[PDB]
């Protein structure tokens, strides 16, 4: 699972953001945006624009 948290933490911060997810997924921009916005809405409790491992599980 952690293996998957990390697949796309390219900058290494132990935090995934919108751009790191975009690539996870890579189709239209709006299509893309909707999915990323979904993820943040869905996971980003503290609303810093990142999802940590806690938010991931």
């Amino acid at each position: 699972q952690l293996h998957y948290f990390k697949m796309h933490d390219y900058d290494g911060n132990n935090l995934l953001d919108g751009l790191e997810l975009s690539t996870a997924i890579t189709m239209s921009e709006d299509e893309l945006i909707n999915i990323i916005d979904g993820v943040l809405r869905d996971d980003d409790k503290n609303n810093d624009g990142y999802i940590d491992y806690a938010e991931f599980a």
């Binding site: 390219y10 900058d11 953001d17 919108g18 751009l19 997810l21 975009s22 690539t23 890579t26 921009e29 893309l32 945006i33 990323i36 609303n47 810093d48 624009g49 990142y50």
Partner: protein, 226 residues
Amino acid sequence: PHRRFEYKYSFKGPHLVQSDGTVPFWAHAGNAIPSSDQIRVAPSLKSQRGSVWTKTKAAFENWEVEVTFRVTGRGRIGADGLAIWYAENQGLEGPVFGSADLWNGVGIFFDSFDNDGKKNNPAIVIIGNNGQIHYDHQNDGASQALASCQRDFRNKPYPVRAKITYYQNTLTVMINNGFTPDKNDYEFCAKVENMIIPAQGHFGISAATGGLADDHDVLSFLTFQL
């Protein structure tokens, strides 16, 4: 104050461009080349103009952007320089460092070339505009200079970084000068007090060359909601 990353107003590698050669959420233009780890906004060629601007506009009251770039040429003299923008309209093409003039907001010009012969270059420079000013190119805009400083950003050994915060009508510009890789070893450059800008609008970045020419590469453009 808290920060929130705004991916939709940002870019970065290692996989910065799509298969089809486009940058997500940004419009690149003229001679800007996006690539996997950076955008060469304008290359070391004669008379280049390139710019990259956010597609969607952006509505935040107070914000910060960290922007990371290199500017490179053989000569200890180079040209023309680079320009970070917040403003109301996408100003893709135009004579102001690759971008549109008569702009509505702020522009932070990294002027490589000493255009008014003053020895005051290279220098960073802040400039307001409400939709009717013409950037005094030949005079570096030294007259429209809300504020400014004299830091040398060419040919450094680490990519240069510029934090540009607008917090409660105070815009501030911090600068790592590429001497350290400490991505948070900023030095104070300058600061503009009591300054409004459009409530909404785009972020952009642009650059250009003329008779002289550096490569102008931007590696990332991270944007935060405060």
